[PDB]
């Protein structure tokens, strides 16, 4: 029941099953692909709690996934380490057979907590977790991966985040620079506008000067 | 380290201003990476703020008090004082002068703010507004 | 007293207490939320800071935490020394950086 598209003199065109097309010519299992998309390539957000907000928690499905051949590269690649609000692991590691995603420009890694009721966290979109080759139905805990779609066809830096209330919709995320220096994440900023206000506060020296971390408001202007 | 201490008339009568100075020693408030604020708390009540000020020159007031209370310092005797127009009955209090922690205050380029907030507390002084 | 507290808290010594903390997004949901803690007869020494930073000095019985515009107090079992009037505080910016204190909670220990 799969669609699977075809190269044609003209464009892509759809592949059919009831009409046996006799102008389509397969000398090779050379001639097929499998390619990862990503989501961000139809204009879909990428800022982190515009993007946990996609992802949810389920049991009693079971994790399946299937490979790639050659994909797009990321602009922005995810990597959780999420613990339930008692201290244990919301996902488990990846398995054997899955490293990351192979090639990214950003990659914003989570550290923080929040409920984790299912046994996996799954796309609410359906959309898959891809890996350095493989996609996946649910996120793997460790591993970077990156947001998107499979089509079949017949022919670098890391931003480190706190957070809590992970599972929740009122949501909190803050933006690191050090240990004991965080800002509040908002929306309107992109990886390197973040990255400006690491330069503008780590230059300036004005860290905190206690012995916890304070946050920052980042004013609105 | 750093002492706040406050100095006033204690007695105040209605409608003057109220002065009321804080003496700093042990580093300097007036001048160093800080806002410093008054506070007060009248008997039976909680903690209500008068106002901030940044060393620099920045200020923050009360609502209630944007058009009776102004804050400035000398940093040549490392003092400050709360001016509060139209004192009376109400504004019984004791008043605190206070430290906003210092080293703590960022401000950028614009679209930049602090992760500043409130530790040291000086002695408090009770003003009593009456004839 | 901007921020809603409740009038007063208690339990006995060792009981897990709490004190809620409730406003809008211009302060407790903009901002992080400090707390003090006032013992009878003096002023309020920081207490927690940064949601759930402990000053120096402040035993690791206090904790709190903050969600949406509300936020809380919490000790993991009281002590007599702990009788206390305690505040939540942040910045609010519907009044350009107008500092709010709620309205003080007076925890009674039994």
């Known amino acids: 029941s799969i669609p699977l598209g075809v190269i044609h003199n003209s464009t892509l065109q759809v592949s059919d099953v009831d009409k046996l097309v006799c102008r389509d010519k397969l000398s090779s299992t050379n001639q097929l692909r499998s390619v990862g998309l990503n989501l961000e390539g139809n204009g879909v957000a990428t800022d982190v709690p515009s993007v946990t907000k996609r992802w949810g928690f389920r049991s009693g499905v079971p994790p399946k996934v299937v490979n790639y051949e050659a994909g797009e590269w990321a602009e922005n690649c995810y990597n959780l380490e999420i613990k339930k609000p008692d201290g244990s692991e919301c996902l488990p590691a990846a398995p054997d057979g899955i490293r990351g995603f192979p090639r990214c420009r950003y990659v914003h890694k989570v550290s923080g907590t929040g409920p984790c009721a299912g046994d996996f966290a799954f796309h609410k979109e359906g959309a898959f977790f891809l890996y350095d080759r493989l996609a996946s139905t649910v996120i793997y805990r460790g591993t970077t991966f990156a947001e998107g779609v499979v089509a079949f066809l017949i022919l670098s830096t890391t931003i480190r985040y706190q957070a809590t209330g992970f599972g929740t919709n009122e949501t909190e995320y803050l933006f690191e620079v050090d240990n004991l220096t965080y800002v509040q994440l908002e929306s309107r900023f992109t990886p390197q506008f973040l990255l400006q206000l690491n330069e503008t506060i780590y230059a300036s020296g004005k860290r905190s000067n206690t012995t916890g971390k304070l946050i920052w408001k980042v004013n609105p202007e | 380290q750093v002492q706040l201490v406050e100095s006033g008339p204690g007695l105040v009568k209605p409608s003057q201003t109220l002065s009321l100075i804080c003496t700093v020693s042990?580093?300097?408030?007036?001048?160093?990476?800080?806002?410093w604020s008054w506070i007060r708390q009248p008997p039976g009540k909680g903690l209500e703020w008068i106002g901030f000020?940044?060393?620099?020159?920045?200020?923050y007031y009360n609502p209630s008090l944007k058009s009776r209370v102004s804050i400035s310092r000398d940093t040549s005797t490392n003092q400050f004082s709360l001016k509060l127009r139209s004192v009376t009955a109400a504004d019984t209090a004791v008043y605190y002068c206070?430290?906003?922690?210092?080293?703590?205050?960022?401000?950028?380029?614009?679209?930049?703010?602090?992760?500043?907030?409130?530790?040291?507390w000086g002695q408090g002084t009770l003003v009593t507004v009456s004839s | 007293s901007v921020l809603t507290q409740p009038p007063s808290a208690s339990g006995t010594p060792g009981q897990r207490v709490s004190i809620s903390c409730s406003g809008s997004?211009?302060?407790?949901?903009?901002?992080?939320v400090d707390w003090y803690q006032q013992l009878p007869g003096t002023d309020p020494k920081l207490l927690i800071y940064?949601?759930?930073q402990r000053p120096s000095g402040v035993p690791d019985r206090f904790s709190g935490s903050k969600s949406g515009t509300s936020a809380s107090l919490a000790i993991s079992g009281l002590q007599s020394e702990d009788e206390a009037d305690y505040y939540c505080?942040?910045?609010?910016?519907?009044?350009?950086?107008?500092?709010?204190f709620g309205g003080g909670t007076k925890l009674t220990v039994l």
């Open positions: 000020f940044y060393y620099s020159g920045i200020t």
């Open positions: 940064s949601n759930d």
């Open positions: 206070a430290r906003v922690r210092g080293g703590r205050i960022t401000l950028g380029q614009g679209d930049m703010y602090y992760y500043s907030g409130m530790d040291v």
């Open positions: 042990g580093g300097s408030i007036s001048s160093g990476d800080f806002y």
């Open positions: 505080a942040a910045w609010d910016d519907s009044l350009n950086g107008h500092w709010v």
């Open positions: 997004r211009s302060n407790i949901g903009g901002n992080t």
